[PDB]
Subunit: 426 residues, 3 copies
Amino acid sequence: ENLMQVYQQARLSNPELRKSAADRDAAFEKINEARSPLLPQLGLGADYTYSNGYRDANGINSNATSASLQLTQSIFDMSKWRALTLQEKAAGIQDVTYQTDQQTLILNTATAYFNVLNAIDVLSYTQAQKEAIYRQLDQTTQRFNVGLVAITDVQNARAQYDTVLANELTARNNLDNAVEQLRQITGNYYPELAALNVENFKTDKPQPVNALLKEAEKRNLSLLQARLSQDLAREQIRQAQDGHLPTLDLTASTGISDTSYSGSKTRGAAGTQYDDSNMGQNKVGLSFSLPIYQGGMVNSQVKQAQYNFVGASEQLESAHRSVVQTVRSSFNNINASISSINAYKQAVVSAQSSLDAMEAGYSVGTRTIVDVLDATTTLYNAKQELANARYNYLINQLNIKSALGTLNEQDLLALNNALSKPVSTN
Amino acid sequence: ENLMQVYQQARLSNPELRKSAADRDAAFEKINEARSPLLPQLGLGADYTYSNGYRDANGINSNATSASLQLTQSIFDMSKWRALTLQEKAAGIQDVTYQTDQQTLILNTATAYFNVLNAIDVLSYTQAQKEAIYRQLDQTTQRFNVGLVAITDVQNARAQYDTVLANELTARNNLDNAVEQLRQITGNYYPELAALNVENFKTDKPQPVNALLKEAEKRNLSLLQARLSQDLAREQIRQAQDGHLPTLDLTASTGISDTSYSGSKTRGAAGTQYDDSNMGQNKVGLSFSLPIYQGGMVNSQVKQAQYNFVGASEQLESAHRSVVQTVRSSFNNINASISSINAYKQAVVSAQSSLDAMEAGYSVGTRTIVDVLDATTTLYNAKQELANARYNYLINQLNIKSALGTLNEQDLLALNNALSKPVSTN
Amino acid sequence: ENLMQVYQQARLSNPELRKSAADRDAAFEKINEARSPLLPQLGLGADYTYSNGYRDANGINSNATSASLQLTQSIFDMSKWRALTLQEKAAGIQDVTYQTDQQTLILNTATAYFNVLNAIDVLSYTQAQKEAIYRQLDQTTQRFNVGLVAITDVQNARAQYDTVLANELTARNNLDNAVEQLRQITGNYYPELAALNVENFKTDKPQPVNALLKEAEKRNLSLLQARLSQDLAREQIRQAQDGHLPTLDLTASTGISDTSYSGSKTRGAAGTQYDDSNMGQNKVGLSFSLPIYQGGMVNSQVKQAQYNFVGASEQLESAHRSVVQTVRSSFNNINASISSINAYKQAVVSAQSSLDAMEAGYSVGTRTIVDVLDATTTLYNAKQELANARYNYLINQLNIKSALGTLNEQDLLALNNALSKPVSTN
């Protein structure tokens, strides 16, 4: 129910987070097959085959029968080690992006949480507006009944009333909308959520921008991923270099053989050579090769890896400019939130005193209760529009921390301190 | 001209629909080559080759003249069947997404069709606004001429007139833009389109939400595609399992070769063995093999397929909760459309009576005709903003029908029933 | 500083432009390896291997020792030439898109610049608004001090003041934002930028739209790229046709051999055949093959390439509809800009005369100076909202020129003519 608990149940409800985790699992597991080729290749084959050599040596008839194990083991080829390193760095990549997605979950969660509150706010306010305009219409109606005014005004207040009805329904509708938005990252409905403890609000001042810039230089996930991409490009480079490598290898195998000769040609002077055999063999030995020159195969690849490299570096710098922009913008947004909160506070005070004034106006009955509710309307609107400003302060409070690439459950707990009273959702 | 006919010509004018159709054609045709490998592989590779030995067995010249056909046919390998099933499911995928795109074309079609209707409205009424403000400029002008109100007001009205002119030009401009928007899907410019039969609106109540839930769950295209994706992942799993398959084979080949001999070394005791060859051959037989352990080849792939599976499943549930969200939101939007239509109707009646009232004001001339056209302004603005609301009702109709995964020409035919009088576009 | 210089320093600062450049370098360089296969394949693969017979073959140990260079050279396979042509066309593609981004850098570069100007504008004027409202607060305050009015008004003016303060901070904030936006393209902060020379502002009429269309047919980069895609699809088609090609080839290689015998079975009646032999060889000759029939390999591929072709064609027409839409829309936007500029000009004149009027009002003291500054507020707001309109005129100019697929530094120079006075940024 509390934002913390909301994070808790939602910690498993997210598929994409779990999806990404599983993807990381795919990467780390893929490292295994990345290690695989270096290991020896035990194998087996078998065959049977009749043959008939027509023409010249025509009339011979020869079935053939054989089977063999074939162990093989390459030794010298660093390219596989290279690919292994690629797999490693890619794994680190997947790790980082996974953490990123975690932070994303945090953000979305908090956002969706606040939206419900805001919807409740607008709901109630639009309601009070409804009643106010309603008795406005009733008054005006009665005023026509005694004939003081033109019918046109009656229809006017009519239109006001219908309009505000639409305003009710759309808002109430937005309520459940946001509710389902919450279920989207939960899979569960919630009857109620804790109200903000506005009385104990934190008007915390921002840290100086430069240190934040430093921490940003140190620990944004994205730029880190860029650097990993760069190093990976370097790995691609040496992998392109790998083509020049001599390929030391070692075969090892044994094989049975049968083959029973037949046909009239075998008859007469078989000379043992035409006789059926039972031979078997245990071949084992080195294998090796070297490309020397291959039409410029391993040449263009080099430059390709190079362009890939420098381009990746460009992406890195782009990320750099990006994080600078983002963090500054966030900081600034926080300040904006501050000032806005100030303004709306004062507005609250204003509408309040105005309200009390008009209430006194009804105290000796100078006005109508309707008007009192008009001031009441302005009052509430100002109220949780100010609350809205506070939540915006919170969101910015996360974004800057998000900008750092840091974030944790603990910040959300600090948020959880802010919550207070239970509040029914619908 | 009518929305139905517009859809009719639209059915061929769309490239992307036809594109997707042809893509389905590709997906189906590819199933054929998916069936292909099982078929026998006939072949030929005759060639000639000189040879000149040296060192130890130096000086014995020769030249082979090989020529042989090679039919081949493996029998046991389920992995290919697996890939066939994959291709099948892929074809189902392409099918589903194709139908989806059809619905998409429908939606966009009706949308663009309505936008024109709206722009016409805004155009006309804006024009009336132009005339009204104009004659205000004239009145105020003359009022300066007789020496009354200060020049500043004159320039004010001037600004009004110029501003509203700009509004005209941008209005007309948007009109032709929308016309082109229509041509974009149609490839045709249309001088005129049918007006809505506003007199006979359909105030249908929405069905209870749960039934719609059950239906859409039963037949949404997207989630269906997800399920196909999951099944495909399972197929990938058995395909990973396929690496344990022994590979039964059957070679079948034949042909002749003539290696003529030459060189001085052949001279002396040729022993028939050094005579020129003239042999042919008819080899045929099985070629079995089983991989045994191979460094963990067919291992990591298993878990990879597994993670692929579960992640796909997570996507499935994701899309599930998603469509729940969407359909509820749609229902809600429809209700909003209802209430809005109500409100604007009443606003229409109101502004109308206000109009008639002021007209009566001019009946003894208390006002100016411009004022009457101000009431007229608010009037028609209200009118076809209400029309706009009705179109929104239509769009929501198609949307709720869309989330079902249903949709067809028929609802659009009912929309065609909604249409009435011809109206020139520009 | 001037827009031209800004473009100049920026012209190298862009990563993505340089990125695309290097990518073009890749596309070109890859043509080399595309040419590569036709070249001769020199090679080598020496190796050594022990052998030990058993069962009938038992007791005759040996160890083969082989070494051989291996040149190879294919003669006839058009598919390689085909793929070469593919690579060529791909190079053309990367070229074109590179040109696209070359325009893209320009557009944004103007955009942010004008945004900076605008931000400066709104900033200053908001400041003036601040001072005005401030003195209203002071007036109302003092008025309460002598007690002419209710406290509620005091709080009202209070609220106005805090609000406008918030507007200041967000304004300044937006200023620095835009500054950083500029740095994003440049990597450099800028103290100052040239003011527009509004006095000599251009108002050229657009060329008639049809001529612009014929011009459009010439060289939009996008559509050209589409046509290249089509031709590429055709190349894919002939490449599918290339599976019918007989594969004429030429083997050419030489190698030595040693192979030493061992074992007691070799002893006795060796018959020369059971003796060590240091043979060498110089094999050379033709190679050839032809598929005949392969289970429908090169069949489904044909239809596949065909579908690829037609789909590409559909994309081409899609691009056609696209460019028509965009160019007309641009033209229209220009017209809108014109009329808007007209309107705001007149508004400026109006507010000006109103200002002078009220100034005269203070000349004999009929009003507060604050009010005069209110007119001042409306004044400047109108002023550089009009400026904003002029920049929109410029942006539209660049847009329509962009739709042409044209654009150059020279148009930006023509823009550079428009600039005038130096202006500090913050």
